[PDB]
Amino acid sequence: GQKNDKNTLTVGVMTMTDSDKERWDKIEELLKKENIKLKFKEFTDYSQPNKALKNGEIDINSFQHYNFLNNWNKENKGDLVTVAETYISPINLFSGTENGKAKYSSAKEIPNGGQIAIPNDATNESRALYVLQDAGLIKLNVSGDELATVKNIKSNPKNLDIKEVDASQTARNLASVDAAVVNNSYAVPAKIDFKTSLYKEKVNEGSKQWINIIAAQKNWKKSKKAAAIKKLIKAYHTDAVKKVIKKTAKGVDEPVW
């Protein structure tokens, strides 16, 4: 059956944006030459694909950054591994909206006692708190690779309430809160207007932790899928695919190969 078919790979992804479709189209097209067939399982929530991969419902996934992976392994006693890097996806603080329009043109306009929604998984929660500091809204007593929670807020001059919600729910909150940090995987399908960005995460040598990856089981190299996974990586790391991602996700996803 499929799990023991050397020429089929089942890939776990989030609900596909148009740019996701186009890039996986090109990968598929390139993999015909190798007689590999791709199948996709789409997930709606970040807690799902690593569970599905451990359970062997999928052969690899392509949805997360290194941090999320390491953290997920820890919370779950998992042993999933990184097989390759894909793109980085600098995250934004987006203005809350009223009848669809931005309430604020810059972070400094966020009112005293206002509310900001962020992801509630350790690594994206922390990522978002670092963006708030960069946007000039808060100060943290922790720096660099060190994880942050609300407990690390040592300055909050506008007395903002930080509402920790699921990464999948930050977008939905924008109509109810003053601003939210929203992963692009969610921001694009929610059809958020990116003019409402009040701050875009910066990319430096310290951003390797937010590089997205393809993940597999620890023993994938001894599995029926080893050859197909290697071929998939070669197909992903082409100019053809790099061009597709840059064209269709310029400023959203940036290939790192």
Ligand code: MET
């Ligand atoms: C599930 S960890 C977050 C991954 C998302 N694609 C990002 O780079 O923000």
